[PDB]
Amino acid sequence: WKDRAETVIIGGGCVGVSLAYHLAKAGMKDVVLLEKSELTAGSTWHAAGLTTYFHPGINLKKIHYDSIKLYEKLEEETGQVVGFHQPGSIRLATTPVRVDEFKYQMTRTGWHATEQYLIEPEKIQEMFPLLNMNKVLAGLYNPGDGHIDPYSLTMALAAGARKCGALLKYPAPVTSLKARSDGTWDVETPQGSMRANRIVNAAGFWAREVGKMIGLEHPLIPVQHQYVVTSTIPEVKALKRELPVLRDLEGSYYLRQERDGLLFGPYESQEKMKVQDSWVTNGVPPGFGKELFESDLDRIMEHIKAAMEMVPVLKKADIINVVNGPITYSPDILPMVGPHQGVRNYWVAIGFGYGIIHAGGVGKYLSDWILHGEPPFDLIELDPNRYGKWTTTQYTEAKARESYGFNNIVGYPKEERFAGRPTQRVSGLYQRLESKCSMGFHAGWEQPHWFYKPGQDTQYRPSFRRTNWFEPVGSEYKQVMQRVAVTDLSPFGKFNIKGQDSIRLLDHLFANVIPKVGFTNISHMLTPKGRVYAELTVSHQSPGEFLLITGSGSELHDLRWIEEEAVKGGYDVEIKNITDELGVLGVAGPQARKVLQKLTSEDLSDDVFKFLQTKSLKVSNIPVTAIRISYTGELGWELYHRREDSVALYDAIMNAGQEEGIDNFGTYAMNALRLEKAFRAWGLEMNCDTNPLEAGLEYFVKLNKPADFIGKQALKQIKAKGLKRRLVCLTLATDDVDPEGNESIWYNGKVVGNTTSGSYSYSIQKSLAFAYVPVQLSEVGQQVEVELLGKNYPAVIIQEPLVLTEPTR
Numbered sequence: 001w002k003d004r005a006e007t008v009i010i011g012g013g014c015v016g017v018s019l020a021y022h023l024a025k026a027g028m029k030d031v032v033l034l035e036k037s038e039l040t041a042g043s044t045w046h047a048a049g050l051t052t053y054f055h056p057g058i059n060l061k062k063i064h065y066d067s068i069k070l071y072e073k074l075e076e077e078t079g080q081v082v083g084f085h086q087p088g089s090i091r092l093a094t095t096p097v098r099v100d101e102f103k104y105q106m107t108r109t110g111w112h113a114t115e116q117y118l119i120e121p122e123k124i125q126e127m128f129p130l131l132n133m134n135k136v137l138a139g140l141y142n143p144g145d146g147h148i149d150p151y152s153l154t155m156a157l158a159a160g161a162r163k164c165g166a167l168l169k170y171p172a173p174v175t176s177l178k179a180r181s182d183g184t185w186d187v188e189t190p191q192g193s194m195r196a197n198r199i200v201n202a203a204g205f206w207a208r209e210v211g212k213m214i215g216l217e218h219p220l221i222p223v224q225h226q227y228v229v230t231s232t233i234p235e236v237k238a239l240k241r242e243l244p245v246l247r248d249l250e251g252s253y254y255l256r257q258e259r260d261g262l263l264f265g266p267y268e269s270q271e272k273m274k275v276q277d278s279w280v281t282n283g284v285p286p287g288f289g290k291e292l293f294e295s296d297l298d299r300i301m302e303h304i305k306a307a308m309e310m311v312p313v314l315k316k317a318d319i320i321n322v323v324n325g326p327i328t329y330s331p332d333i334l335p336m337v338g339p340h341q342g343v344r345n346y347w348v349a350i351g352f353g354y355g356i357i358h359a360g361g362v363g364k365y366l367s368d369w370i371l372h373g374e375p376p377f378d379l380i381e382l383d384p385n386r387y388g389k390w391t392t393t394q395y396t397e398a399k400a401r402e403s404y405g406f407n408n409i410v411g412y413p414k415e416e417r418f419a420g421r422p423t424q425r426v427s428g429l430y431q432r433l434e435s436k437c438s439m440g441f442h443a444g445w446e447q448p449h450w451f452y453k454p455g456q457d458t459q460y461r462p463s464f465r466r467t468n469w470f471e472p473v474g475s476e477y478k479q480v481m482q483r484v485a486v487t488d489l490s491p492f493g494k495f496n497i498k499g500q501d502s503i504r505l506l507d508h509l510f511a512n513v514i515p516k517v518g519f520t521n522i523s524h525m526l527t528p529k530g531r532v533y534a535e536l537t538v539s540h541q542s543p544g545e546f547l548l549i550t551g552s553g554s555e556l557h558d559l560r561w562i563e564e565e566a567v568k569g570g571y572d573v574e575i576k577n578i579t580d581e582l583g584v585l586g587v588a589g590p591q592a593r594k595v596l597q598k599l600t601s602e603d604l605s606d607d608v609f610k611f612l613q614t615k616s617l618k619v620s621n622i623p624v625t626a627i628r629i630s631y632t633g634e635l636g637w638e639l640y641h642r643r644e645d646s647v648a649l650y651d652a653i654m655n656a657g658q659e660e661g662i663d664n665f666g667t668y669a670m671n672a673l674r675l676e677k678a679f680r681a682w683g684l685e686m687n688c689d690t691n692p693l694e695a696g697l698e699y700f701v702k703l704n705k706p707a708d709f710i711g712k713q714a715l716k717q718i719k720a721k722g723l724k725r726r727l728v729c730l731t732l733a734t735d736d737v738d739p740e741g742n743e744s745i746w747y748n749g750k751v752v753g754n755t756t757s758g759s760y761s762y763s764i765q766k767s768l769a770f771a772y773v774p775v776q777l778s779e780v781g782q783q784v785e786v787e788l789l790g791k792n793y794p795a796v797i798i799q800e801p802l803v804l805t806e807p808t809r
């Protein structure tokens, strides 16, 4: 038993062993896993074992995929029987809105290896004989997946792990972690102490518990979930093939073949289900493990009834087992995966809702991150720092109670959920604007989506096609192009960075040149291999003092990188996160100057207040820092101010521009605006998937700036070889629907790429999409076909930009 570990993993469940297997197979030395009692003693052993190629999301299709592919090679690897049953999986549409969901999911899977099929009821009768075909309209089918034995899965990964040099001590629970100023760790088991260069928390529902050992709120809550096992069924025994795993979405239950009977479990109402609040307040009772909850069948009876109806053999069969167990839910049901910001060398893999299908893939992910220094592909959706102080256990219970219940609701585009809202993270502006718009949840913040025109509909109305906020966004669009309008942009991520090494810090953290004093420019942080880890505004205020602006979802994601690089290069700087004390305000449109000039004594002429210049001034004797910048592409300023002034400032500006007919606007409006200027959004046109040259960002990337910035020589290798694909811009005539991004694009039979984002263009009266395509298909004038809701629409690459920006005009 060694006293210096390279990587220590707290957890012997199936996600901990996943990481040990992959880290050790990758050749990491001294991998050490510490478990409280025994492997699989957590949630894992009792799991229903369902493993599907299917995911509603986008990049999570790759986690599921990487898992399934590994799980196959695993008997062959270890000598052990993992218990992988692979009949296929089939989600049922029983309503027509559900057929629509399937068409929307299929266009999103087309540009993925994940092989997926929209199938007829005839192919489901042949596939699942005992099924009631009476209301079934269609099915979503993935061949090559099904379920697996969690025990046999975990043990098989351990044998792979041990065999490649991972040491798996148990029982040896951590009782104490102490951070060391040199970035290492001190772990404390009842066996003794040891030092790991990094630590990985994979402690299931104890994750929150262990996180506190180094003073962290991990927003996780154990949830009660039951499933049911029947006795043998004669018609089930009589089938020659194994039934494919079903999901009657409209009943909200999954079902599968267990031996010669049926295993099924529902997701009860968010009002009906139970959570382990007591375990967050008091912590998990010690001496818990290899252990279940008392069943509560009566609370899911409504759902059993439905199950009996879709599959009538159940009406006769008998129940053998009711497994009521705990699962670790984060607020949005997604796991928290990656290095935790604020603490050095602490990674997490916690809050897994679907840990058995996620384990393999998440293990290859984290491991490829540890051993490379950057994520292999982009999963900011899974990023552990997407939460914050606002993610209080109050909120954490509410939305998690929702994520459960909403497991099988219809996955709409621009989906909105209201559990736990609003949060503590709100600008003074919120209370002003709430009564007059639809507020979209972004990173805890409440920020408007679209503003209510009077006499027109204001209910929440999601759809796969154009919906009730269509023309209001048009009026908003028309508003900013004609006059002047104000949007709230307080959610931005905001970093101030002063100190002696700061230009040495930013000049290597960024690919663009460092802006002259009193200026701003758009800069990207590349990963060492060349992907766009982040885009953000670099404002240069006092010589050597910088203000960094970024997106609300990409705030702590981006800070973490800046912090770590300051640590690695041993930079002498100071970085504070001023994000919450500042409110932001965009004022954009032709009339911005006429309106803002009358509120300030500062000269706002185009000659005097240049584009991208930053300046300190007072708007109505309210101290503000104004940047001549706008994501709209229209004449405009961003006014950064203290959170208290937001109302007083907003009011002054509204009052002021009443002469020019000033009005409000929001993000939905803002999308349509920027897309016409062909502006790229990080996380959309670009993220860790993409490098800046192929995303058409050559403009912001000075490959001959003297500094060997993070990612330079990588890029120089890309530029030298030449791109394989390039980001283009398309228009298309649609009927009733617009693209939003992640729709597949077709050329003469094959799928050849995808759209990253879309919108209707209110000025040319067509639709607009950004898209990745082969270079042979990337010329201006080139036609492609874009899959939108089951129908292919012809689209054609235009010369970008559609609308010139005010300075270029």
Ligand SMILES: *Cc1cc2c(cc1C)nc1c(=O)[nH]c(=O)nc-1n2C[C@H](O)[C@H](O)[C@H](O)COP(=O)(O)OP(=O)(O)OC[C@H]1O[C@@H](n2cnc3c(N)ncnc32)[C@H](O)[C@@H]1O
Residues within 6 Å of the ligand: 010, 011, 012, 013, 014, 015, 016, 034, 035, 036, 037, 038, 039, 040, 041, 042, 043, 044, 045, 046, 047, 048, 049, 050, 051, 172, 173, 174, 175, 202, 203, 204, 205, 206, 210, 225, 226, 227, 289, 323, 324, 325, 326, 327, 328, 349, 350, 351, 352, 353, 354, 355, 356, 357, 358
């Ligand atoms: C309850 C349940 C879960 C479930 C399911 C059905 C039911 C009824 N069906 C699933 C499915 O169809 N598909 C799927 O992918 N997952 C399903 N799940 C459950 C869940 O996703 C998984 O069980 C997931 O693995 C969660 O487990 P995780 O890998 O995160 O870890 P764990 O097994 O819960 O336990 C972690 C281990 O760490 C040890 N520990 C705890 N405290 C300490 C300290 N202080 N020091 C060291 N080690 C510690 C625990 O002993 C535990 O073994």
